[PDB]
Amino acid sequence: GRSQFVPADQAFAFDFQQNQHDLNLTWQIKDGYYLYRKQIRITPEHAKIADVQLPQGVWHEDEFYGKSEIYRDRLTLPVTINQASAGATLTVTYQGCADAGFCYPPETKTVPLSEVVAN
C-alpha cells in the first residue's frame, strides 16, 4: 500500500445529524487510521451547548504525541444544543494519524446548526 495516501476525508469520514436539541457527530475511521482524543475541539458560534464528554478510547504509542488515547473504527459523539440562533454554527476540529507512519494535519469542519429556541 503505497497509495496509503488516502485523503483525510476518506480516512476520517465526518458527518452529523441534528434533531432539535440533540446533535450527533460521527466519524467513520478507516482501518489502519486513528483519531487523537486530545486533538478534538468543538466550538459553538451563536449557540450554547452542554460540555461535551469525549468517550473512552484505547492507548497507543507514536512519535508525534507519545502515549495517547486514540479512537479507531468509529467515533460517535452526542452534543446537546441548549440554544442556537438562526445561522449558528459548530466548529469541529480533529486530528488523526496512519498506522503506516504519517500524521495528518488537523481538519476543521463547520456544521450549520438548525435554530433551537432556549427551553
Swiss-Prot record:
Locations listed in the record: Cell inner membrane
Periplasmic side: 1-119
Disulphides: 97-103
Function according to Swiss-Prot or TrEMBL: Required to facilitate the formation of correct disulfide bonds in some periplasmic proteins and for the assembly of the periplasmic c-type cytochromes. Acts by transferring electrons from cytoplasmic thioredoxin to the periplasm, thereby maintaining the active site of DsbC, DsbE and DsbG in a reduced state. This transfer involves a cascade of disulfide bond formation and reduction steps.
Misc. comment: The consequences of replacement of the cysteines with alanines were found to depend on the conditions tested and on the reporter system used for the analysis, and then differ depending on the references.
Family: Belongs to the thioredoxin family. DsbD subfamily.
Name of protein: Thiol:disulfide interchange protein DsbD
Protein species of origin: Escherichia coli (strain K12)
Coverage span on the entire protein: 26 to 144 of 565
